[PDB]
Amino acid sequence: HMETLCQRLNVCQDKILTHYENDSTDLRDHIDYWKHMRLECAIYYKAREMGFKHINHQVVPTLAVSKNKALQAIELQLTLETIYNSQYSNEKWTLQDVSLEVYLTAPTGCIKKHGYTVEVQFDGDNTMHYTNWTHIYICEEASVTVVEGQVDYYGLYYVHEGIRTYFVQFKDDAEKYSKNKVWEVHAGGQVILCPTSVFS
Amino acid sequence: HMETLCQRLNVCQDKILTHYENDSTDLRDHIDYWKHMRLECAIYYKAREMGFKHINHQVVPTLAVSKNKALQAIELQLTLETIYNSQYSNEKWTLQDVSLEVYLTAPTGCIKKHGYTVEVQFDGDNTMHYTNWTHIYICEEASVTVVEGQVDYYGLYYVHEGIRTYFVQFKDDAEKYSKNKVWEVHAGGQVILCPTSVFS
After folding, report:
1. B140 Cβ partners below 8 Å, 6+ apart?
2. Which of A22, A174, A180, B138 has the fewest beta carbons under 10 Å from its own?
3. B81: which chain A residues are within 8 Å (Cβ-Cβ)?
4. Could you give the residue range(s) of every CATH 1.10.287.30 domain in chain A?
């Protein structure tokens, strides 16, 4: 075991680093990376179950940490596999496109690409920065549809199957930071001003 | 599309039939089968989305049917992949071992093998038949442990991580069929009789 776990982790961790070095744009390679990310969790989970506090002088996480990371790896592996079976399969996909960091940025649980900043001024440049995305992949059990990140006076949203879904509502930050609920949105084009009447 | 979906389904369905013909005992092949089962759902889902009521004169299911089947294929694909990364990977695994029929038999959500009948007589041979399993694979996010199906006066159970879990409780059938709550369990060895006092 000791040896067996060490050798398995070493092989697993070498594959992960090789993916990092190569920086491929082929979706197939990203699938294999996330499968290795998932396998690493199974190795640490077993090491922890066996009572090891380190493997090769590297900390072995608690079981709950390894379970949670394997769930994250699974979500990414599955998503990429659904994309692999769709019409979007042959696009360019970068490692950062398929990273957990992107995946969890609003809108959470979605691979996304071609991100850019939208800035909201809550009175004169409290000024917040938010990421919008031209390509948002909505993956379900047997399908995927790419939608575009759109920008409102009210926030950032997409429209999927007819349904407009806001993933950022600018009023949330305004009520947390500012005194007035009136702002100006800059997103790479005409500033967006409040479209309704403003009062006393 | 029409052509594209037809050709994809034809290729997908030929692979599924080839797995059926070959009858392998290698876990790797069962992984590939369930990936094709999942892909078939994505093809039918797209066909239905596109308004086709049949593809090649075969009925296209409603979307909800294809979504539900892809979830089932995913659960089996993931399970087999967790087994592939464990110490049980090189055992024999049959197509029936990895079938949805087995997977959903109590205890549900578990690949299992080496099943046999236990018979319970609710007074003199209402006589019920239940399947018990010598090998039950409890798969979680980053691990799998094989447990054995065990037999009680009370039912069928396994013990996982110290916790005894009944997957069949014989009192459920007795209260649904019989007048007295006293039975005799036959499971391939000594009959099991009621172990407590019986009353007026």
Report:
1. A67, B82
2. A180
3. 35, 38
4. 1-102
Contact: A41, B71; criterion CB under 8 Å: no
Neighbours of B188 (CB within 10 A): 10
- Distance in angstroms (rounded) separating the CA atoms of residues B60 and B50: 11
Distance CA A170, CA A184 (A): 10
Strand partners, A139: A144
- Asked if B38's CB is within 8 angstroms of A67's CB, the reply is no
Structural class in CATH, domain B103-200:
mainly beta
Tokens describing residue B109: 């959500």
Q: What are phi and psi of A54, to 5 degrees?
A: -145, 150
Verify whether the Cβ–Cβ distance B141 to A74 is below 8 Å. Answer: yes
The answer to whether the bond into A107 is cis (omega within 30° of 0) is: yes
Chain B nearest-CA residue for A78? B74
Cβ separation A140–B67 shorter than 8 A: yes
Where does CATH 2.170.200.10 sit in chain B? 103-200
- CATH, range A1-102: 1.10.287.30
Residues 135-194 of B with CB under 8 A from A: 140-143
DSSP state of B183: -
The 8-class DSSP code of residue A179 comes to: S
